[PDB]
Amino acid sequence: MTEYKLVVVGADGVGKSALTIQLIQNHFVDEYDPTIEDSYRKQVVIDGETCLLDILDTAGQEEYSAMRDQYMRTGEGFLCVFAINNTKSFEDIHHYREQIKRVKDSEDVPMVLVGNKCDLPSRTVDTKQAQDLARSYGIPFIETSAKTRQGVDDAFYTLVREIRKHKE
Ligand SMILES: C#Cc1c(F)ccc2cc(O)cc(-c3ncc4c(N5CCC[C@@](C)(O)C5)nc(OC[C@@]56CCCN5CC(=C(F)F)C6)nc4c3F)c12
Ligand SMILES: Nc1nc2c(ncn2[C@@H]2O[C@H](COP(=O)(O)OP(=O)(O)NP(=O)(O)O)[C@@H](O)[C@H]2O)c(=O)[nH]1
């Protein structure tokens, strides 16, 4: 079994908890306390490899310290999540990427950009806009629905594929 330390980052309300809880418990949670940050572990097979996924679902206040720095740099891959009906969450992605790059002290950090809530009609962030920022950073882009589970497995597996590429 290969262990893979994944961190899900992004604004409040984008569905970081819904996405984690779908992969790991296979149900959609309408309300999950927005304050609650936790690690979830799941044994899964990805491309024939048995993996233990250790997923930090981030929450809480914007609050930089040496110990939050340490905690974040143990992530091997980051799922940078925005909601397709939340322009501000999309504009925040650069920030999250910059904090990842800083605590990793590196410009090549395994990462997937995730456009969540693709089930919703009110979309303010176009696929094309997201695709453009992805190709810019050199990372995969995937649209997801924690609600229907569209793209959820693919999102997390794609990240794992990214971690493999990075360590050949
Ligand atoms: C997230 C994150 C994070 C990493 F991804 C990597 C390394 C980090 C090292 C740290 O010491 C701290 C964090 C970290 N933790 C929380 C963080 C946090 N909160 C408030 C909203 C929800 C939450 C789950 O993101 C927790 N929020 C932000 O950015 C929020 C914005 C919006 C308000 C003003 N902020 C700066 C910004 C832009 F766009 F320039 C977005 N960063 C966090 C951060 F870097 C790191
Ligand atoms: N329609 C729809 N609703 C979603 C989807 N994912 C999450 N939601 C909803 O959007 C809200 C936020 O979800 P949640 O997972 O709590 O967001 P979060 O990023 O985890 N916030 P936090 O930082 O507190 O953990 C909830 O009402 C949840 O039901 C999705 O793909 N589609």
Backbone angles phi, psi at 7, to 5 degrees: -120, 125
CATH 3.40.50.300 fits 2-166, yes or no: yes
| Ligand 2 proximity of 146 Cβ (cutoff 6 Å) | yes
Residue of 11, 136, 13, 134 whose CA lies nearest to 62: 11
- Ligand 1 center–CA 149 separation, angstroms: 26
| Ligand 2 proximity of 113 Cβ (cutoff 6 Å) | no
Give the resolution to one decimal, in Å.
2.3
- Give the C-alpha separation, 11 to 91, whole Å: 10
| Nearest ligand to residue 78 Cα | 1
* Beta pairing partners, 38: 57
Indicate which technique resolved this structure. Answer: X-ray
| Ligand 2 proximity of 116 Cβ (cutoff 6 Å) | yes
| Ligand 2 proximity of 38 Cβ (cutoff 6 Å) | no
- Ligand 1 center–CA 83 separation, angstroms: 16
Q: Whose CA is nearest to atom 12 of ligand 2?
A: 13
For residue 29, give both structure tokens: 């949670």
**Domains of the chain by residue range:** 2-166
| Ligand 1 proximity of 71 Cβ (cutoff 6 Å) | no
| Ligand 1 proximity of 163 Cβ (cutoff 6 Å) | no
| Ligand 1 atom with minimal separation from the 58 CA | 24
- Give the C-alpha separation, 122 to 63, whole Å: 31
